[PDB]
């Protein structure tokens, strides 16, 4: 967390064609991994 650039390194482990599998995988990564907070709640503001 102390670096000036934040990168995540990831590779698929395997027991050809890997481009579109990686595309689908990263698409799923972007879409579905929750980080924190309850779903169906969007940007929340606080008033005084």
């Amino acid at each position: 967390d102390n670096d000036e650039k934040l990168i995540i390194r990831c590779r698929v482990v395997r027991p050809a064609e890997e481009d579109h599998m990686l595309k689908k995988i990263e698409n799923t990564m972007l879409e579905n991994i929750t980080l924190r907070g309850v779903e169906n709640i969007e940007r929340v503001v606080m008033m005084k």
Binding site: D1, N2, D3, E4, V45, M46, M47, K48
Partner: protein
Amino acid sequence: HKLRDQVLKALYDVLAKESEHPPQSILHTAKAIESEMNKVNNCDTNEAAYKARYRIIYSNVISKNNPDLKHKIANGDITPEFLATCDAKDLAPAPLKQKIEEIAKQNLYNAQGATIERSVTDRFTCGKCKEKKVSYYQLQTRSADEPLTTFCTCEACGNRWKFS
């Protein structure tokens, strides 16, 4: 003990890699082992948070920015405190720290939202509080044969009323 000796090997490597190559090799490996025991004073190979704190301290030593932390740990920075810091956000380095507080301040500003503020006048009195801090608006609601609505909004207590 494999994790013990691995952390020791890493620590001896990073302190031998310092710009101040310490001729006090036994003293600096004593620093390494005492940092090892005060590090395992958290969990001693019982929880992965030990590994996480290891990653934090190891990469902070590596980073460059900053390099001066190597000399500062070689000549001070008593490590039993640095088990219990968890203070990576307040070290290595100060410009990045200042960046962090200004980021946090801007985020806190952007969190709190709309604050429309209801421009007033002083002519009418409140329907309930009876004081003159009255704010209004104009628009016409019903059919064309009549004028606007003359909406009212008190601000001394927040009352709403209307005038024809």
